[PDB]
């Protein structure tokens, strides 16, 4: 069910990421560096456990989770959130909750590219990843 998402992906297009980061309260210097980085995202499974790594010259993260089971997460911008990831309409939907706030990170495959849509407040960011061989 998750298998077309698996692999190594590189950022090749980003729209409105500054808006998204600013909405989350990320400081200007961090937004500035992040606007020029191109992360690599690695998605792997082992049975029911998925591991999602995000690597760059600036920040690295890693999360492991089962679909549909809440997990604690500390995000790249240091929010301590309650997270759940599920498949919805063939999209991989990651919901983060903290302080009564929410943000969604939705991943969808379109023509072999991985489209990540990030929503917080009114900010909507679209980031496109292409698969590494």
DSSP sequence for 81-100: EEEEEEEETTEEEEEEEETT
Per CB under 6 A, 93 contacts ligand CCCCCCC(O)O:
no
Residue 107 near residue 2, CB atoms below 8 Å: no
CB of 45 to ligand CCCCCCC(O)O, least distance (A): 18
Q: Is 127 annotated as a binding residue?
A: yes
Per CB under 6 A, 77 contacts ligand CCCCCCC(O)O:
yes
Q: Is 129 annotated as a binding residue?
A: yes
**What region, left, alpha or beta, does residue 101 occupy, with left being phi > 0 and alpha being psi -120 to 50 degrees?**
beta
Which DSSP letter does residue 103 get?
Answer: E
Stretch of 2-10, 43-51, 62-70, 75-83 lying at the interface with ligand CCCCCCC(O)O (CB under 6 A) = 75-83
Per CB under 6 A, 127 contacts ligand CCCCCCC(O)O:
yes
- Residue 27 buriedness (CB in 10 A; 0-12 / 13-18 / 19+): exposed
Q: Annotated binding site for hexadecanoate, which residues?
A: 127-129
Residues forming the site for ligand CCCCCCC(O)O (CB under 6 A): 21, 24, 39, 41, 54, 75-77, 116, 127
């Amino acid at each position: 069910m998750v298998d077309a998402f698996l692999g190594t992906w590189k950022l090749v297009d980003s729209k409105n990421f500054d808006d998204y980061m600013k909405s989350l309260g990320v400081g200007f210097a961090t937004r500035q560096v992040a606007s020029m980085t191109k992360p690599t995202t690695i998605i792997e499974k082992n049975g029911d456990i998925l591991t999602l790594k995000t690597h760059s010259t600036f920040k690295n993260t890693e999360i492991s989770f089962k679909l549909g089971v809440e997990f604690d997460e500390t995000t790249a911008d240091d929010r301590k959130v309650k997270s759940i990831v599920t498949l919805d309409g063939g999209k991989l939907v990651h919901l983060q909750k903290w302080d009564g706030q929410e943000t969604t990170l939705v991943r969808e495959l379109i023509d072999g590219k991985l489209i990540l849509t990030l929503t917080h407040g009114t900010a909507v960011c679209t980031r496109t990843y292409e698969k590494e061989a």
